[PDB]
UniProtKB/TrEMBL annotation, chain B:
Organism of provenance: Desulfofustis sp. PB-SRB1
Binding locations of Ca(2+) 3: 165, 252, 254, 295
Disulfide bonds: 102-107, 189-191
Residue numbers binding Ca(2+) 5: 165, 298
Taxonomy, superkingdom: Bacteria
Alphabetic keyword roster: Calcium, Metal-binding
Full-sequence range covered: 162 to 562 of 642
Residues engaged in binding Ca(2+) 4: 165, 252, 254, 297
Record's protein name: Uncharacterized protein
TrEMBL record, chain C:
Superkingdom of source: Bacteria
Binding site for Ca(2+) 4: 32, 34, 77
Transmembrane segments: none
Stated name of the protein: Uncharacterized protein
Amino acid sequence: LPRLRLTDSGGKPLAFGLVELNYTCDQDICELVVHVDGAVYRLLVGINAPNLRESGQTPVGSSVFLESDLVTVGLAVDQIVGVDQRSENFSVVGTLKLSWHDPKLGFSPDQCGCTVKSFEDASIRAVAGEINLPLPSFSFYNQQGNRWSQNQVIFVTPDGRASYFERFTVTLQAPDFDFLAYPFDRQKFSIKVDLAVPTNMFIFNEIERFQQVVGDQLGEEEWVVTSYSQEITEVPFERGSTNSRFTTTLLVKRNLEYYILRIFVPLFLIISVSWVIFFLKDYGRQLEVASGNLLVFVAFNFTISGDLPRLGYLTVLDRFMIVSFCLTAIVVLISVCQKRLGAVGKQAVAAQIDTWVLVIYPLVYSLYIIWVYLRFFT
Amino acid sequence: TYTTGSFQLILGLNAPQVISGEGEPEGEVFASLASLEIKPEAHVQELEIRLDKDTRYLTQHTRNLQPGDTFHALVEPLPRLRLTDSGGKPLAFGLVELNYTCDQDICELVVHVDGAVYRLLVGINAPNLRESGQTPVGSSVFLESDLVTVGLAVDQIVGVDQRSENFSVVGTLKLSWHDPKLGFSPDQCGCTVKSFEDASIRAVAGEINLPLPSFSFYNQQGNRWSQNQVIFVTPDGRASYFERFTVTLQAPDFDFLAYPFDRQKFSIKVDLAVPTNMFIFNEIERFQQVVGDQLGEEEWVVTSYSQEITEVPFERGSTNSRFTTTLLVKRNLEYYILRIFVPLFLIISVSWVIFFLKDYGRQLEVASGNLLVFVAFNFT
Amino acid sequence: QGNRWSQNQVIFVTPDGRASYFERFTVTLQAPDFDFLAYPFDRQKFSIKVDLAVPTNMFIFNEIERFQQVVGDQLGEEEWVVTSYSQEITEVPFERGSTNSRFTTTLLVKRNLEYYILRIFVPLFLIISVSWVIFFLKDYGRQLEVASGNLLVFVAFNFT
Ligand SMILES: CCCCCCCCCCCCCC
Ligand SMILES: CCCCCCCCCCCCCC
Ligand SMILES: CCCCCCCCCCCCCC
Ligand SMILES: CCCCCCCCCCCC
Ligand SMILES: CCCCCCCCCCCC
Ligand SMILES: CCCCCCCCCCCC
Ligand SMILES: CCCCCCCCCCCC
Ligand SMILES: CCCCCCCCCC
Ligand SMILES: CCCCCCCC
Ligand SMILES: CCCCCCCC
Ligand SMILES: CCCCCCCC
Ligand SMILES: CCCCCCCC
Ligand SMILES: [Ca+2]
Ligand SMILES: [Ca+2]
Ligand SMILES: [Ca+2]
């Protein structure tokens, strides 16, 4: 059995549980708070109902405890306008909508001769401070710097139904990025909207899809969206209590054909040039061609240096480039050794080395690819 | 709990209008203060003070004295002792002992000791300071500084500029203190928490006309971006501040001589903008992990961290508190080793191996080609 | 996108009630409709949309005035060449129901083709011709050496 007590809105005690409790109102207006402190329990409460021991009827009348105001939310993404891979942030353009019901905002038409009252170019905080009523203000959790806003409007109906509309361009931090498997990496773009009020005042309750969540645009894009989701949760809030959160997540991947055709095929041809020369039996020509192919490899590497992000740590592509360069240089070393062996009159050993290299090199490349796949993608 | 504050009391005798709370004084008095019939309660406090080479002058402020009160002070290790009001007009001089009596409605006093370590004894309504006997009784005679709790957390290092020697960081800051002047009565607002939003501590202090512990970043470059800025106060007077910041800080201490094997320190300094006799940092709160973990790799790897409170000289004399967070960082060594040193070693080996050849034309041609390969790799 | 820079902003009204607005602007506009697949032979549209912030039952665009040339001529060459333009008034759905008017200006533009042709394609053709012509030789060592050199020349031109 837990302890039960009753206090006013300031914390002054009024009654204590004996578990049951009773009180009678003396002041002009009494605002009460019920404390239960200690497992699952049943709490029964009534006003002007001394028969709570044996009620009989299903709960009648209006609710005794105050209820939170319910908010409908929706978000749509129009265009991803940038991604920063060193500072780990991205920028997005979209639209946001909020809707709720509050009888305190209602008005009488015969005093204005109008059905719709509107506020323009003002944040919800400013309007709340102007009309001296609490409203469900919000913020972006990972916002970097100021936010650009267009078509900002709030309008209210006589019954008290209010709605908010905004078109935004914002930059959001994303420390969850992981570029280890570049360019085969997959990322998540998460947009979080948090209410700036306690959960006992306002709470997100429904999700509205006023448009397509991810909009289609003409032409190609750098990032391709595979799927999306939307969810409502609760998170701890400053000064205790809890605040609601609305999250939109986009799963994205890069364009693979671009990287494959631009990098890997020319690299394969360059490697093949250094492999094929071992069929020659004139070792001077082999040495000269190997020396030229190393320079060609370096030139291609710095030509593609533009598609090589500088992050301060190694990706898959960097490792492959390093291994390929090392093997290309080892080819030149072996060619010099074979030239010397042929000069001293041991051509048979040079031919045996040629056969060994021709057999071994592709096996080494295939084994390295298998190892990379095992250690980075499973 | 109990409560503290000032009050107004209206007493009436056969005057039924008093219960309305608006009774104006009338007639001839009938009641008086009871405490005036006996001796007043004494307060005694003892302090140990030291006059360093550069700190030969010391001053202390006393609480307010009511008319009719008396003040006593003595010093035993001889330095000079004197008493002045808050402006500074002299009131008494030491003979070392000193004595004074209060004439004005409110008296604010300052004790001067100037010249080694000395004992200072002070009392209000306590002429027996020569032989006190009892351990220091009552409330403190000298005013006390307000104690502030501070904490800081780092979320992400977002950039480092190696030519201008500055870096940028994202994190969270928290402050908490207690001030009875900020207290309020709930029955006037029907609420337990009063809040201020989207305003700096300076702006709120200027709006409510009360001193508050404002702060700044010592090495801040340009403007600072702030989110979720809020101040809220409880009826007892407990206040707290919260902020999420993104800031760029100068760091002239960087040294890149041993690059890429260099090690650096990222130091974040928070200084109070008020004298130490008003507010002072006293405790460190760890509300989160000081260094937060993030998915993926980072350019800089944090090895260790520390947090410390110190005191630094302040403009217009006195001193101000400082809270410092330091991160020790290093670069990723595998990246540089695998990307630079191994290919360089292979290139050097190519130029070394050619000397086994006995056909010097081939050796010359291969050396000439390898020099060009070296230059190409260097610019790559 | 972001803030707009404005100069010479003025509103003046006559006693009869005739009012007019004037502004000189510099602005950055988003254009997700771009498609660069056929680069450098691509053609694009630059669209400028002005929307009234009031319901159509209050104010509506009714006439188009050509106070100047829509596309102004400037000395020197430009990266983009305007081929044609158009102006039109339409109606679009508005927040809190109803409708709002829209005024659209569209410019059809293309790149300078001579620049790309002369700078890229002719040297590439000559480089390809060098690798084609060597097969007339019957000394295969010379052919191999020239092919190896021409591959490096190709890579150098590509990164140039
Ligand atoms: C290393 C680049 C790829 C070249 C093709 C290799 C296929 C395997 C053929 C092995 C032949 C060995 C003959 C002695
Ligand atoms: C200079 C690059 C490293 C090459 C390996 C050198 C190891 C020392 C061997 C000395 C051999 C001398 C033979 C005459
Ligand atoms: C490939 C670059 C262009 C070179 C000109 C080719 C024109 C066609 C001539 C075919 C001649 C075949 C002779 C055996
Ligand atoms: C999903 C990832 C597929 C990666 C395929 C790489 C293909 C390399 C082509 C080399 C051809 C010579
Ligand atoms: C969706 C998972 C894709 C996994 C691709 C693995 C490729 C391994 C070879 C890498 C060579 C650089
Ligand atoms: C802590 C610093 C270690 C530096 C080691 C350098 C290794 C160079 C490798 C060369 C291999 C041929
Ligand atoms: C409208 C597009 C015309 C493209 C013409 C390309 C011309 C290539 C010239 C090559 C000469 C050797
Ligand atoms: C694009 C990566 C190419 C690497 C070399 C592959 C050799 C395969 C040997 C069977
Ligand atoms: C979507 C991947 C296409 C790559 C084709 C490669 C053919 C050698
Ligand atoms: C993981 C990188 C290794 C670089 C040297 C490879 C030589 C076969
Ligand atoms: C963390 C340093 C790894 C470097 C390995 C080098 C092997 C030749
Ligand atoms: C406007 C296109 C001119 C290109 C001329 C090319 C002549 C070989
Ligand atoms: Ca990350
Ligand atoms: Ca420095
Ligand atoms: Ca597009």
